[model samples]
Target chain A: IEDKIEEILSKIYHIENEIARIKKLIDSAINNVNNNVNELANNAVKYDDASKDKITLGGGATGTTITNVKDGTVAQGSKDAVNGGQLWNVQQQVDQNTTDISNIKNDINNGTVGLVQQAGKDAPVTVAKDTGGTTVNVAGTDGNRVVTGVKEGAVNATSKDAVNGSQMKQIEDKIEEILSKIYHIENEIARIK
Target chain B: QIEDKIEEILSKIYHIENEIARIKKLIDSAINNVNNNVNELANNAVKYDDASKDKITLGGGATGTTITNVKDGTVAQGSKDAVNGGQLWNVQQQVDQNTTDISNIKNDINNGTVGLVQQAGKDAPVTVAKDTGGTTVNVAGTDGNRVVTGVKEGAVNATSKDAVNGSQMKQIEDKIEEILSKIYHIENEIARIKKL
Candidate 1:
């Protein structure tokens, strides 16, 4: 199990590295696309200027000349805007994927740690009573008929080996620590947003 | 020799402890990396979005019903709406879910028998005995807001000990079972050593 945990840790490290690289790619891809949009915007401005320059004086030219130029500029601008929107949507999807991967990574890391901790904690439990020494059965004489360790009404204070309240509390406290660590993992997950 | 066997058990226990420590460090480090990734992801989301949507308004066209041109990156002052919403609420539910899960686990650990149960996920149910009053708490999958009760309420040199509750019973059961096993094993080893 320990070897498996080590292997998992190694694999997750590689995955995180890969995810980091992918993020850089996504960043650059979106950045490059937006840069293209800016250049397109500038081109649209130039074309609009071209349409204005086509305007000329009185009798010879109708407004029809600049009309085509104006129409062309608007058409190109609208097309570029839509194209940019599509690229932006792609970025959104990629971002979602990035978050999803993070969720999976945290889940595996947290789950593995949890089960290992469980096994460790579970190893402490003792299942049977220590009836090994001298057969000092209390109820055997009382006819009270209890197959227990303590004598009936004997109240052996020193030999009482019951779980101390403090020990039980400590067990809970340790479990709480485990819960606390898992809490950190959850917080990290939430911080992704 | 009995000494040799005891040393072997101790060594194994120490090894397990070391593995636990190593795994803990790894978990902490990985969590840190995830945090960094989340921040970077959020920043990139915002930056990539900002440059994609520049609006150009048609202004200075001599307001006489002029065939105003809308150039890119240059907006007419009166005709621009360059903002909308999406980023504030995106993937926030993931965080809320994570928070809820943590809350649930904490709640279980503090209030339920889940003290012994390792809860990696939220909403997992755990029933554990509270300190020596007898019987265990069996509630699960409820709102994770409760004051913790029965933390070491029983003790050997204690008044609550006479009450001899469920918590103490469980503890004694555990201790005896474990000691019995250990005694049997050691006795076997001692007999073997005597022969040797």
Candidate 2:
């Protein structure tokens, strides 16, 4: 029975290390993702200067109004007077700008920004889990508290009159549940004890 | 007389060609800068995403011993049942804050960056003309009928600041091309005159 109890006690230590490891991993991931999100926020700059004037082409002369045409053409009294290489180049640049804007819009829609947001959502916050360099005090289910100092519950299985047996049992049960979730098992009680 | 006219025509052509080159270069530079900025933003996002992913994916192969189960289980149970709900609550709040931050940045990019870019695109296609030192007129007399000679004054095209749209830029380019062609024709006329 002492061997079984000692084994269960060893399992308790194992569970503590596992919790520490899990907490460490959670912290690392959360902190990392949080940093990434902050950077993402930082890089979002207003690159487009919207302050420029947008004007239609017009002239002082009668019948010399130049409206926007898909094809680069200078309309003179409803006639396409001329299209030149330089004019085509101007049209091409505008078309390219339009295309670039469209691509960026697509990126925004297709979860380029959304994923970063989701990763931030998946990350965790900082929680101080360490004891004050001394005994760790934990609340038990019966509204009682347990202080596991340099040693854990002194309740050995053989010693049936151990005062904190119920509390130790409660601790073991709760940790077993958490371990099962992480390890995808029905129970770590058998593994531990 | 024809030579002076021809010289003037050639000079106009030279200036127009240079202007055309400059405007084209402007368009190219704007496009390049925008692309590079966008690329860096995406690339940085990916690197951060991957780093976070690596940390999250390491939750496998966890097996606790009997002693850990007996001993440290209390700490785990304590933290889970402790104040402010627990670790999960702490984690959830962190996630919520980050998610909100992301949404804000996303809003900025959409409303601020995208809209500004769109406006820039609209403004990009026009060529704003500036003052070209041309014909200067200076005349002052008691009756306002006397003309002064060799006096220099500058007239800037104010409307040129408003300039032309993409299609209008095209028109301006077309006009320049036409002027160059006319200069060619005038030069041919001078040659014909010289033959005479």
Candidate 3:
């Protein structure tokens, strides 16, 4: 019986030592796991950063491409990411402008004309000269006669100035003076007879 | 004495067993805590593999969510960089500006008017007139009294579309004057005959 009790005590001591060793191992493992978890949590990306409101791609490094991004809203006030389609639409509008610019350049280079208004008239008229004659006609809207603003032309042989009404009236007055002189000469010849 | 010693040793052994059991339970609890911590860490971390179904929600899908502090991306025909809103807004603004400029240019070309060239110290643009095979440049009058000034003398020919000036009409007046002088000389001769 004494031998049996001694054997039981020895076995209990060994079991206790084994339990202590196992406990030590578990404590070490728990510490190691806790440390590893802390490291991982520190390195993980948080939903929010104290310093920034945006997610920096590849930690703000260069040569990183983000794929599978959804297209964001676009407007005068929107500050969203514009997709390829949005950019394409903008490019298409620009291309339309290009076409319009080209057409305008052609019109300018080819000398396309627009309408002009006449002086002293509310209605604008088309001033055109007849190719068959030296007559310049100022045609108004709806087949009406329009007044032209002919500047006082230079009276010379080489000048191709347009004669105004006042200039023509001066010529008529000169002709009348010559006619009156002729009439006086005729009267003088009749008195002599 | 031997029986008493055996009982005492057994009591001590019982306490040791109890202590070992307590330590074992603590170890088990520690393991459990460690496992829980590990699971929390895994769930919080973004995995490198695509096997997970976790989606990173920006601002947790909240309204007014903005991803700020983004770098300027590379803009090229083949570049796949993620461009920001400000960059795109700049592009849109430039396009709008270009549209406005083009419209103004169109108006200038059509009206034969220059609005921007005044910065070059020119009062008005030199407009060329075409007689045929092109559109005509219409000279509009402002308030019905604006005369078309600075007109150069046109060529005196059958095919010339230039405007003749006032000086050209003076030739006709001079001829009329010459004829009148001749008539006066005839009238003087008639008077001389009467005197004879």
Candidate 4:
């Protein structure tokens, strides 16, 4: 009976030692699992309500640029990231507009199709036309002003034109000739009487 | 003495059994915790790896949400890079300047207050009167009166619309006065002959 008790005690001691060993292994495994969970929590990004689906670069660091952005839709209503190509198109359109504006300015400055100013007050007025005739009307200033530069016209009775000072002198000469002939006729009549 | 020893052994066996059950429970709980953490990590990995959708929202889709500390983008005719706010502002300013320039040009053309010729200086710009087969140039007048200073003599003909000067009209007046004087003298001579 004494020997049997010793054998049973020895078996119980071995069983207790094995159970202790297993408990130690479980404690170590639990500790290792806890460590792994902490590491994952630290490294993973949070996408909950608190984060609001935002990714802060370096949590507020400066000089950050997001590259490789694909061209977004360019419409009246679109909220997407625009690439360099889309912006380039906008700039090209603006440049074209500028070029067109420059052309218009040049046309206004140098084109002869429009009205032009005289070089000075003494410069003769230039009338321009395109294979056609032009009529000039001298509207008076404040009232009727004397018009100058009239060409001498024909002084015949059948002719209807402007007569200059020289034409009037010819008419005066003819009147003097008529007077001379009338004096000669009077003298001849007196002698006969 | 043997009964007492058997009772003590039974007590020790019961304690060991209880300890073993406790160890099993602890292991099961630990494994459950590990499984949960590992599953959460896997979910996060999937979310991050999916690049087809928009994962980040700038400014959280809310008002006053701005992303600061951005670098300037490349500005060139052929550059395809993201531009910053400063670059975009510069473009807008250029467009505004162009708009003002166009407006000024329009005003200048419409008012006709100044000449369009760049080399002609700020002379009196002539207003265009008529333009069809021919162009009629009109001098810009002040207070409904315009004086044409330098005029060339035009050809006199049946179809001539040229204006006559004061000197031409004075010549006609002198000829009419001389003819009237000669007619009066002839009438006086005829009266004297009738009386004799």
Candidate 5:
């Protein structure tokens, strides 16, 4: 029976490893898509205009970030609207979002680190407490009840060993780290747009 | 281990998005039926969005003529006709005529609507574009028409609706950026280790 249980566990472990490998590959691929796709889009938009013509900066024909002074003669375009964000626009926001999502793919923290994880076995109670006739009197002692029935079952623990707490804790830490990394990736995505 | 749970979550979200879209479409159809119940009482030719032939008796109550040109981007509080038993009482419920909404109460900016109009100064009125029910609040969209409720960010967070809810877009974008930065740091660490 123990060997049979072991076989089942072995099968589960095998399946789990296959699944983890697939997921790791998927994560890496998705991260690349997110990051690179946005870079492509950014390249398209970044080179769209000549800042010198669109926005006048510092006497010399330059970028869009022009600054102005107290006098009417010295003026900056939009006057650094919000600190260092004078030129920030909707497109910039979008590009930043894509970049953030793409970066999340690079985190080494992933599922493959945990090569194996043990899942618990289901318990089966084989012996019933009482079945058929209950009383079975023994001739040796008057106090002995009559033995009329017999049954199997006491939900006994299958084993005193499994994955220990230290190992489990290590697995949990790895999983927690991966989760946290994913969470950050999602958060950055949210912040982008 | 967590992939199973994640797949389940993503799948559920995708399903919910589809259902919400269907419901919104149904509601639009129902509203169209109610708004254009009458054939002649309505102007602007045949109902712009009537799929049913339910004649809504022109005027039978105190409600004024139903205003349907909700796409101009701005609806003043007084512009909507007041209800009375006198001249021009329209008893038609507005079936959604594919609304467009945009209304922002900003002071004006350099590259935004305010900046555009401030430069034009009452000459070139600002215009924002948005769908009627895609669940967004773009240029003078529903809010501008005085009928829109949901936003880009809001719909995204609530039901993954198409239109960008301003708030939800903002939130999600922010979160994605922060997480990706962390991921970038992780990559840097790995590279550094490899260099060692």
Candidate 6:
């Protein structure tokens, strides 16, 4: 019986050694496996072409839109254009300024016209003698006064009323651009599930 | 008495062998731990690198840093341009893309954990982190504003200081988590390997 038990103990010893051998192999196998895994992990950037660029055009677009989905991003107005009166006022003021500038130019072109001259004519009537009459002088060919002071004379004046115009293009450009964009956004939003 | 002494000596030898076996298992375990740590670190480092890169390429946060400009004055976006779009994507598209991103992350973690189990034997659990802490970027709203944090990972939060800290903590946490996982795994493996 003692011999049999001894034989069993020897068998246990053999099994222990077998376990050791297997454990070593497992260790080496584990090492090799881990090495490969770690290497792959190291090159995950290279290996995973899926994430070659984490933020790709197709991939990122969906997220970006959803993230930004909000109310104020879009707004609608009852009137396509501003109140007509406001627009007209601005256009009229600009027209008036243009007219003033054009008249100034026309006066310059007219040889008879003088800068800051009277409207249509000089003072309608001149003051009588001893009633604050004014005098003026003129230069001569040699820079000497050819004309001397004269009192109480009436003269005509010069003012212009030239017309001006502009082309009214691009008035509907914004509407076209905006309408197309709205349609595009509407189509995209419809497709979104 | 002499025979008892011999048996005691033999018991001591057996104990020493067991201790050696324990140490051997520990050594392998340590190696596995280190490998896992390295793997996790490499993976997370790559992920961190990718996130950082995406910040520039795709814009960071759910809604990245905002850039404003003057109406007519020169609003210099600096060396780069906020004028040029990151992905050319709109709001809805970005959100869908992020959903896919989350899916990919989940898939990768699943595949990675399966690979670990296939190699390291089953019963080893893997964790995919979900963090709450990250940069909160606010986007414009007619009603108000909204916030978005980058990615989710607890390890990042527990130990974050600055911009770099979030990523730094991620790698460190990954390694430590692997180490902790390995310790438990090795202890169990030693007992089972003995039984086998």
Q: Is candidate 3 or candidate 4 better by DockQ?
A: 3
lDDT of 1 by residue, A1-193 (tens): 4565565566557656755765675576556555655544432323224555332221122211121111111232231112223335545755765676576456544433222121232232221112122112112122322122221121133333433345456556655655565565456445432
lDDT of 5 by residue, B70-129 (tens): 122122574422112111111111111111111122122222233111223333322222
Off by over 4 Å in 4: A1-55, A67-89, A95-193, B11-15, B18-22, B32-36, B42-196
Q: Point to the candidate with the largest TM-score.
A: 3
What DockQ values do the models have? Answer: 0.01, 0.00, 0.15, 0.07, 0.00, 0.01
Q: What does the TM-score come to for chain B in model 2?
A: 0.24
* Local error of candidate 1 at residue B163 (angstroms): 10
Q: Lowest-lDDT window of 10 residues in candidate 2 chain A?
A: A125-134
Give TM per candidate: 0.18, 0.17, 0.45, 0.40, 0.14, 0.22
Q: Is 3 or 4 the stronger prediction by lDDT?
A: 3
For model 4, residues B1-196, the per-residue Cα lDDT tens digits are: 8779877887877787788778788778868877787877655442221222333333233232333333454667965444445555556567768877776766665444334221122333232321222322334433332334233344557966565433444555566667768766766776687688
Segments of candidate 1 deviating more than 4 angstroms:
A1-42, A45-123, A126-157, A162-193, B1-84, B113-196
Q: Please give me the DockQ of candidate 2 compared with the native complex.
A: 0.00
The candidate 5 chain A region of ten consecutive residues with least summed lDDT is: A108-117
Better of 3 and 6 by TM-score: 3
Chain B TM-score, structure 1: 0.24
Superposed model 6: Cα runs more than 4 Å off: A1-9, A20-25, A44-193, B1-16, B47-196
lDDT of 3 by residue, B7-100 (tens): 7877877787788778778768868887886887676564222222133333323332344334557789976555666787778899899999
Give per-residue CA lDDT, model 1, range B57-118, as digits (tens).
Answer: 33324321123332242235753212111221233345456556665654543332343333
Worst 10 residues of 6 chain A by lDDT: A159-168
Candidate 2's error at A37, in angstroms? 63
TM-score of 2: 0.17
